């Protein structure tokens, strides 16, 4: 799926399970039905009450953004905008029209088309910035679902532990029945902390990391289109746009 | 952030209690010692 | 009652009740009248001291904003604003007025009226923005009651437990009844930290999630009215308003 | 005393103490002299180190703002500003002076005086805004003292509890002295969570709420004075000022 | 949850006190040998080592 | 030494020690070597790794601000600025130069020199604001050291406590000395929470409280110097500067 | 290394180990294989899932900023900017070029070069601020990796603890040896809390502390190059730039 995530999941499985299996435990004991039902069922219930149904259908798209493989195409687009800046210095805006057309980046294509149509520079900034802020809000809405799950899961673990104790204190006399319960106390803790910390809070973190790269590329394209409209020289254009790339 | 500590302490302490609830569930009781506290603890409420 | 909320409340009940019934408990052991009185009575008391009485009077309208169905009117009003622009491009002062006369959206009606009356762009912006700011503040004030109840509930939970312990450890007459008796005192904790995380803090999240949609439709209407006043062409109007739609 | 606070204190007492008496306790038991010294002595200690002494003299004034009752003057003042707006156009600025000679609201009386004296729009905005900012900062500083006592009381509870354990273990050999400790342990906990979540953190929320209302009335008066200086018509004034009223 | 998590400070306190209660009860209440050696049997099945 | 801090430390010491001594326990039981070394030594270590060496030399200066006795003379300065505002207007700016000379407040002295040298109003505002921003940053940097120290100390306690409990749990073969061993383990928790709450986190509050008072005086002079440049009349100047006094 | 970090690591190791050894036991009991594997392996897993792979390659460069000893040359660059201001005033901008030809500071070398090429003042501010913003973003990205390692490590300690107990309770075995076996399980929670609050969370603080120092030098250079374009006198230049130095 993606390289840092794949190495992370391998390292996590090998560390946590390899620790336990080495000490002489069996993986069988890490499953307890009621502990799973309280912690996972409770987490899903809190998230479903907290968000409208259309947001939950975005959850598929959120995961797909998090584990999208990297594309270095920002470098190519910097050379494209520099070439177009040189066309604008040499030639009329009609020439830009041909050059911009058929570019695989729609945000750049539209931006340039607004300049060919002769629309005024602060208005071009305004309409482009509306499109960037829409994309930023969309990625924030994905991350907020995973952050919410990571907040509820620990508290459902506390419910599972308190519910477990309520059962064990009931039977301080019957030794046979004690074992099944004291487990649910221990396991319901483990699913609460482990699911929150490894699955949910990392996926939230990764969506925000990948969103920050996407928004920086959009900001660079906006600075490119505005510098083409101003008629800046290619050396200065190259300098400004390079500040966005690392 | 200044509350970084509580969420760890609470997790750790609970684990001890689940253990000692077990240990006291694998132990007999002293006949008079339990009373020594029971009479005293009752009187604390100022009965 | 939206489908996500209904499924959420079903799943929440099944999670916590299933978590007790599947390990040998029964519902009659989870209900404890005194614990309900301390936790819910205490929460109501802390919220009543926290807010003026006129705030608490509003609480019904908060739940109606949370659980009312989505009906996605924004796709219709987008066509209406483009139609109005197409009329303003021709005979704006008079024809626009008739179109809005019976329109079901008041904010659009009054917005256009300021343009028909010939008011200047920064003043029509200022009056419209005051109405949006008022709506944003109103929805925040609904959510703040729930968020506050969600904070007080868990702590009123612990007041319940400590008071129960205070009563048991007082009269520790029979060492065989310590376990069965100390179990009940912990019921309250479960009401506190379960109500907060499956009802109050959730409903707070939904109210905020739905203010964020209502305010965005008002921002679209504002951008529509100012675009109509500028005499923008239908293509530019549509290009711009679509940034608010998903 | 506001009606919500009175009902809140009634409900809080009835829920917590009514619960305790229903499970058969005694109110006298919930009194412990040593636990009062550690918790209530502790909070006083930390709050006095936290704030200059002049802040503590303000603390009396803060309670008056929270528990003073509402009388909702704002409707009257809105009608006054509409009347005054009409008078300015028909009879010139001079007559306003007569009308505002005795108005019981000082902020409005001055704001108008600055317009009659002939000051320009951005400077009358600046002077009025400085007075609003000063009132906002004054109310914030009252709230901060309560929020801070609410932070330190719960922690002084855990100090008290741990001090309890030391004494009991220090005197565990004699199990007949075990009780006097278990009391101080719990009661120091109880005084912590109770005081903070029913007397301190609740009062802080009221101060911030009952401020937000006072600031919104001052912002309405500022928009009234600026709209009077423009020579805006009565329909525009009534529309604009109505955005501030709930 | 920035201030929502405030209740945890109180929780820690509640479980500290209960830790104190049980630990002392285990103190000098010498363990019934049968009960323990039985408890090892009670749990072994669940975790299956 | 400052009177609120002195009364606070008296009340705190009597609060904690008086609470213990009422139950007869010796202070020697509450004193421990290893708990002090782990909690205080750990806090010193964590803070030293956290900051460069030069910031630790500021720690002396930080305490000197917080416990500095109030001698604020802002009333006197408001009279000086109003006097100059009338001298500047009557006599012309050259007379100001003599009057400003030797005034003890350096920020006021410098400011007027900018206005005597005839520098433009946005430039005067820029240079004066850079000086206020520098002072605000300096006082924030002092507070951050203690705020940090108060977040490391409690967690260092969980380390001291766990090392204690690791030892005690070695004696589950004998209830002999099991209790007195557990008592010592928890002492490390007590020093962690007690130092954080009563010493470190409170002193942070005072630095921020007393900082805010000093910055408000400097913002008054910035309005003082700018109103002297503009040539505002004495009644209006007196009005504006009074909004900054409390 | 940075001298404060070296003294901090000395003090921390002596406090933790010296505290442990003083109360008793042996260091040979404080090192445990599986506990290290679960805590460190789990932390590495959560960080790798959280970030793209390219961010983790920056992690080496992050430590260098934290433990880089200060060169504190900024006083020299203030004298360079003051000298250059006088060169520009007498000779005209051409002379600036020759003076800065070999300057070791790249940001100043460019800033001046943009001014001698005769770029407009709002353009030179815009291009230079983009470079400062880029450095602020870069240092924030380094700090965030260490912070996020610091928030996963304690919870991995809780997971390690629970899995330790679970293996034990499984094979309860001998009743005289229960204590030692559960004791070891708590070694894990020690590695979680110790690593986060002495190694990871502290290093985040240094990277943000030293970042802020570097950004202050860049802001001084920006005010220097704008002041040389405006043609300020040496006394005014020196006063402005001194506000950035402490």
Author numbering:
A (entry chain E), C (entry chain A), D (entry chain B), F (entry chain C), G (entry chain D): 1 to 246
B (entry chain F): 14 to 60
E (entry chain G): 12 to 60
What does the study report here?
The stator complexes act as ion channels, converting the electrochemical potential of ions across the membrane into the torque of the rotor complex. Two types of membrane proteins, A and B subunits, form a stator complex. In this study, we purified the chimeric MotA1/MotB1 complex from the E. coli expression system without flagellar formation, performed its structural analysis by using cryo-electron microscopy (cryo-EM) single particle analysis, and present here three structures of the chimeric MotA1/MotB1 complex in the inactive state. Each structure is represented by a heteroheptamer composed of five MotA1 and two chimeric MotB1 molecules (A5B2) and chains A to G, having the same stoichiometry and topology as previously reported for the structures of stator complexes from other bacterial species.
Two of the three structures (Classes 1 and 3) were found to have structural properties typical for other stator complexes. The Class 1 structure exhibits high similarity to the CjMotA ring of previously reported stator complexes. In the Class 1 structure, the MotA1 ring has pseudo-pentagonal symmetry. There is a cavity between chains D and E of the PbMotA1 ring and chain F of MotB1, allowing solvent to access, from both the periplasmic and cytoplasmic sides, essential residues involved in H+ binding (Asp24). In contrast, another cavity between PbMotB1 (chain G) and PbMotA1 (chains B and C) was not open to the solvent, hindering access of H+ and its binding to residue Asp24. These features closely match those of previously reported stator complexes, suggesting that this structure represents an inactive form that diffuses around the membrane before its incorporation into the motor. In the structures of Classes 1 and 3, the two plug helices of the two MotB1 subunits (chains F and G) were clearly visible and were located at the periplasmic surface between two neighboring MotA1 subunits (between chains A and B and between chains F and G). Furthermore, the plug helix bound to opposing sides of the MotA1 ring, by crossing the linker to their connecting TM helices.
